[PDB]
């Protein structure tokens, strides 16, 4: 009575959603990742800084 | 900043686990076939029991 | 710097996949009995058919 097929199907939902989101925002994430640190510095906050 | 850091934390995990869909696919095919066999065995067992 | 970025990219995957050990252990056990039964059936078949 393992009934893990429900579990495997939830895992499928998650992994397929992850792949779909990767397709959806793969480019945005890749363009964000090399220059993420800038988000910590907001122009006016740079003066207040 | 914090949101982006969280996203870049999760996204590698998303990329890491996305590949599992296909191994998962055959996994569930086999598992569901096995449950079909289990259900058949259970039904036949009960059928004979009487 | 580049090595560090690579390492911290690895760490997500490292933890995620390390988490999968035990679920894999039961799968390995199960698949092992499957093979054992395969060998048993294959043998029994061979000795009978001889």
From TrEMBL, chain A:
<comment type="similarity">
    <text>Belongs to the SMC family. MukB subfamily.</text>
</comment>
<comment type="function">
    <text>Plays a central role in chromosome condensation, segregation and cell cycle progression. Functions as a homodimer, which is essential for chromosome partition. Involved in negative DNA supercoiling in vivo, and by this means organize and compact chromosomes. May achieve or facilitate chromosome segregation by condensation DNA from both sides of a centrally located replisome during cell division.</text>
</comment>
<comment type="subunit">
    <text>Homodimerization via its hinge domain. Binds to DNA via its C-terminal region. Interacts, and probably forms a ternary complex, with MukE and MukF via its C-terminal region. The complex formation is stimulated by calcium or magnesium. Interacts with tubulin-related protein FtsZ.</text>
</comment>
<protein>
    <recommendedName>
        <fullName>Chromosome partition protein MukB</fullName>
    </recommendedName>
</protein>
């Amino acid at each position: 009575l393992i009934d893990r097929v429900e579990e495997v199907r939830e895992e499928m939902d998650e992994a397929q959603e992850a792949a779909r989101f990767l397709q959806q925002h793969g480019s945005a994430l890749t363009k964000l990742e090399p220059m993420v640190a800038v988000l910590q510095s907001d122009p006016q906050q740079h003066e207040q800084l | 900043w914090q949101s982006a850091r969280e996203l870049l934390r999760d996204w590698p995990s998303q990329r890491h686990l996305a590949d599992r869909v296909q191994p998962l696919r055959m996994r569930l095919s086999e598992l569901e076939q096995r449950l079909n066999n289990q259900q058949n065995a259970e039904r036949l067992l009960s059928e004979f029991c009487k």
